[PDB]
Every structure is written in C-alpha cells, then in structure tokens.
Chain A
Amino acid sequence: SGRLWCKAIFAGYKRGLRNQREHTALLKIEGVYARDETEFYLGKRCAYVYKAKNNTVTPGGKPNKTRVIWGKVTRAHGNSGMVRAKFRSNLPAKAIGHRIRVMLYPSRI
C-alpha cells in the first residue's frame, strides 16, 4: 500500500576536480546529513528506476516499459551523510540530480 524505499539523489560520480571515475556513484540519501546517521544504509541495495520506448520483460508478470540498473551502497562519502554506491552498469549522467531508490532489504535490524 505504501513506499518501501528511501529517497536518494544521484548527485554526481566519484570525481576529483578534473577527473571523474564513473563506476562509483555519489548518492545523497534524503534524511541523513552526517556520517553519524549513514550507518543504516551501508550495504543496502539501491536501484535507478527509469522507463524507455521499447517494452522489456518484468520479474513477477507482464512486460512493462520501466527498467532498472541495480546497485549496492558500498561505503559512506565525505562528512555530511553523502554515500558511495557502485552499480552493475555505470549510471548514465542524464540521471544527475534525479531520483534513484536506496532500498531497505539487505536489512540488519
């Protein structure tokens, strides 16, 4: 009936000032604003939900237009609740400042 994932923002890639490393993404999870509070979300699965033109098969039932690139919150970033997530396919940078879902279900509570 309700939402079973937390709001994250694909803010950027793991980048220096003049070099970006696309294989590691930076996830701004809404709610957590320090490394104090980042402890829960480490090792959690995080999905980039997008929809395209051509239909693709879905695990559960009928083929939708909606797709994902799956991920995994690797470890905490910076000092302000930013987190590093490493995706199985390196995210497209059209998704910069768009909604990707930090899930709950590599649960350890």
Chain B
Amino acid sequence: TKASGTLREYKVVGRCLPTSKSPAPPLYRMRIFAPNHVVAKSRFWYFVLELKKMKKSSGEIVYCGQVFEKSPLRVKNFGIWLRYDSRSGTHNMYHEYRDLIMASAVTQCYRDMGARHRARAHSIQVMKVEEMAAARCPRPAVKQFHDSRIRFPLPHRVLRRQHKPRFTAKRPNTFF
C-alpha cells in the first residue's frame, strides 16, 4: 500500500461465494487503515488470504464503510502492534502514539516506521490499534505529556515567512 495523506480506517467485511457444502460461509471482518475504499478492499484480500483459503475470485466483499471517530475532540493514547520487514528478516514491534483520531495515529505510525527504520507501507502490517489508559502506556516519549499542569515555552522561534521581505533592514528576532 501507499500510506498517502491521512489514512482513513475502513470496516471491510466479506465471505466466500457459496459452496454446495456450506450454503452460507462465515462473514469475516477487518480493520483496514487505507487512503481510500478502493485499496482498503485490495488490502482486505491480502491479510485474509494470509489467514484463510479465501482469494478475491473465490470470495466477495460484502460491506466497505469508513469507521469514523467516536471522539475526534478527545486527546487519546494509541498502542499500535506492528509487523514490518527489515533488510534482514521481519520484527514484531509495539509502538505508542498520541492523537485525537485512531486513523491519524496509524498515519503518524507509517511516517515514523519510515522515519526511524526506513520501512515502507508494503513492509508494514498493522495487526492491532488499541486506545490505552494514561497509566498503561510504557514509552516516556508519550508519558512526558501526562502532566496535568504541563508547561513549556517555545524557546527558539525559527521564523518562517523568510522571503516576504527577502531584503529587510531589521535582523529578525526569535524570543517571541
């Protein structure tokens, strides 16, 4: 997949077009984090094929809807269990993020798995995203923001809008 823009979380259910043996096969649901519905249904078959004898042609996509945010104004802890392909073997990772939105935190994961480890969205397999209690979060990078009276200035204000004069008289300040 191409982890493009902000990922949207899609609920994709699907089952096997019926056999004479089993007239109604069991409906299989998945949490797919995809840029759009078209690739969400493509990524649905990828994982289901890894798990079951259910291909695209010997199967059907039953429902394809975006599972939206049920609290997009609350700041939340998110714990994403990874499975990314390194340059030698694959590794199970547990990573933690801090966003209003579940799909945004998995977007925030895809950039980070690229940033630190140079893994691409094809290598990465998001197996579980669980919203976490503030006392159940191990990383100190996310813990450090769990202070009720959190208080930091913005010390070195590296000014943007550098080419708006382009030529000025004043040397620009950074203690704003």
Asked whether any CB of A lies within 8 Å of a CB of B in the complex, the reply is yes
Query: Chain A residue with minimal CB distance to B163?
Result: A33
Q: Min CB distance, B10 to chain A, in Å?
A: 35
Binary interface profile of A, 71-90, with partner B (CB < 8 Å = 1, else 0)?
00000000000000000000
Query: Chain A residue with minimal CB distance to B164?
Result: A33
How far is A39 from B64 in the complex, measured between Cα atoms in Å? 44
Note all chain B residues with C-beta closer than 8 A to A33: 163-164, 166
Note all chain A residues with C-beta closer than 8 A to B166: 33
Binary interface profile of B, 25-61, with partner A (CB < 8 Å = 1, else 0)?
0000000000000000000000000000000000000
How far is A32 from B28 in the complex, measured between Cα atoms in Å? 58
CB interface residues, B 126-176, toward A, < 8 Å: 163-164, 166
Query: Chain A residue with minimal CB distance to B165?
Result: A33
CB interface residues, A 18-51, toward B, < 8 Å: 33
How far is A33 from B167 in the complex, measured between Cα atoms in Å? 13
How far is A33 from B163 in the complex, measured between Cα atoms in Å? 9
Q: Min CB distance, B166 to chain A, in Å?
A: 7
How far is A33 from B166 in the complex, measured between Cα atoms in Å? 10
How far is A33 from B165 in the complex, measured between Cα atoms in Å? 10
Question: Contact residues of A with B, CB < 8 Å?
Answer: 33
Sampled A-B contacts (3; CB under 8 Å): A33-B163, A33-B164, A33-B166
Q: What are the nearest 3 A-B pairs in CB distance? A: A33-B163, A33-B166, A33-B164
